[PDB]
Structure formats: structure tokens, C-alpha cells
Scaffold this active site. Structure first.
Site, mmCIF file in Angstrom:
data_model
loop_
_atom_site.group_PDB
_atom_site.id
_atom_site.type_symbol
_atom_site.label_atom_id
_atom_site.label_comp_id
_atom_site.label_asym_id
_atom_site.label_seq_id
_atom_site.Cartn_x
_atom_site.Cartn_y
_atom_site.Cartn_z
ATOM 1 C CD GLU A 1 69.511 55.543 87.383
ATOM 2 O OE1 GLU A 1 68.273 55.491 87.349
ATOM 3 O OE2 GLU A 1 70.261 54.959 86.536
ATOM 4 C CG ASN B 1 62.407 48.362 86.484
ATOM 5 O OD1 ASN B 1 62.610 49.489 86.108
ATOM 6 N ND2 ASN B 1 63.153 47.775 87.418
ATOM 7 C CG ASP C 1 61.707 43.343 85.069
ATOM 8 O OD1 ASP C 1 61.304 44.246 85.811
ATOM 9 O OD2 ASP C 1 62.838 42.838 85.220
ATOM 10 C CB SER D 1 62.438 44.320 88.822
ATOM 11 O OG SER D 1 62.723 45.160 87.696
ATOM 12 C CG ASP E 1 65.003 50.443 88.965
ATOM 13 O OD1 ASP E 1 65.202 49.214 89.025
ATOM 14 O OD2 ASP E 1 65.143 51.085 87.911
ATOM 15 C CG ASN F 1 66.141 46.088 88.708
ATOM 16 O OD1 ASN F 1 65.185 45.638 89.249
ATOM 17 N ND2 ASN F 1 66.286 46.054 87.368
#
Ligand SMILES: [Cl-]
Ligand SMILES: [Cl-]
Ligand SMILES: [Cl-]
Ligand SMILES: [Cl-]
Ligand SMILES: [Cl-]
Ligand SMILES: [Cl-]
Ligand SMILES: [Cl-]
Ligand SMILES: [Cl-]
Ligand code: NA
EC number: 3.2.1.17
Length: 129
Positions: free
Chosen positions: A35, A46, A48, A50, A52, A59
Site C-alpha cells: 500500500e 483514485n 472516482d 477519492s 487514499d 480511502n
């Protein structure tokens, strides 16, 4: 902060993540490795909209507030910035909620793809724990 492998394993253990919801410490170290490469300041946007955040790339869609993720929730009740701290407490506490959410560590797609069913014990091998 960029954690050492055994350093992060030891912090995760201290914060009660070792075998949390049945997931050995190795699983958590492996997930953090893929990660964030153990970097608490890791951020990734992301598709969309969003974002992380942190060692476990939590998220903004569900788990933290960043003020820039329309229609999102903040189920850990934290600013996403708290997830970037050199102190992993907020990340660990939020990951506890995430992993309890019904799909276990499958919530972390990189854990499913890179850690699940592998020799995750390797990630804590040699560590003083
Ligand atoms: Cl490593
Ligand atoms: Cl393990
Ligand atoms: Cl909020
Ligand atoms: Cl938002
Ligand atoms: Cl919320
Ligand atoms: Cl906030
Ligand atoms: Cl810490
Ligand atoms: Cl599970
Ligand atoms: Na949010």
C-alpha cells in the site's frame, strides 16, 4: 515517516493489530508494504475523486474526511490528514474498523492481490516482537 519493516511490525503489535480479526501481524505488514512502502505520508488519488492516505492507504470515500470527496462518509471520524502522521495510532484504529466491515482484509485490494495466501510470516521473520 518511512518505517523499517520490523519497526512497523512492532508498532502494529503495540497498537493491538497482531491477530486482529484473525489476521496475523505478517498480513498487516505485507499490506502496508504494498500500500505505502511503509511511508506514512503516502497519498494516492483514485479515479472516482477519492484519495487514499497513509501506511494502509485508507480511502476518503468511506473512512476519513478530506473535504474534497463528494458524497463520501467519515466512518473513522478523523481528518484524513491524521492518517499521515508518524504516529500510526489513527491508521491502526481506522484499519480495525475497516477490517471489521465484513470482507476482512479483502477491503485492501493489494492485500487480496499480493498478500492473500502467501507466506506472510516472511514479513515479520527475524523481528524482535
Ligand atoms: Cl521490506
Ligand atoms: Cl504472520
Ligand atoms: Cl465529516
Ligand atoms: Cl468530502
Ligand atoms: Cl460519516
Ligand atoms: Cl475533519
Ligand atoms: Cl507509532
Ligand atoms: Cl475474515
Ligand atoms: Na470522506
Amino acid at each position: 515517516k518511512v518505517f523499517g519493516r520490523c519497526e512497523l511490525a512492532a508498532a502494529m503489535k503495540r497498537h493491538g493489530l497482531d491477530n486482529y480479526r484473525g489476521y496475523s501481524l505478517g498480513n498487516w505488514v505485507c499490506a502496508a508494504k504494498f500500500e505505502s512502502n511503509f511511508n506514512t505520508q503516502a497519498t494516492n488519488r483514485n479515479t472516482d475523486g477519492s484519495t487514499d492516505y497513509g501506511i494502509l492507504q485508507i480511502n476518503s470515500r468511506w473512512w476519513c474526511n478530506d473535504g474534497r470527496t463528494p458524497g463520501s462518509r467519515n466512518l473513522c471520524n478523523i481528518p484524513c490528514s491524521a492518517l499521515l502522521s508518524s504516529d500510526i495510532t489513527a491508521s491502526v484504529n481506522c484499519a480495525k474498523k475497516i477490517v471489521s466491515d465484513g470482507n476482512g482484509m479483502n477491503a485492501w485490494v493489494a492485500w487480496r492481490n499480493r498478500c492473500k495466501g502467501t507466506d506472510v510470516q516472511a514479513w515479520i521473520r527475524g523481528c524482535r516482537l
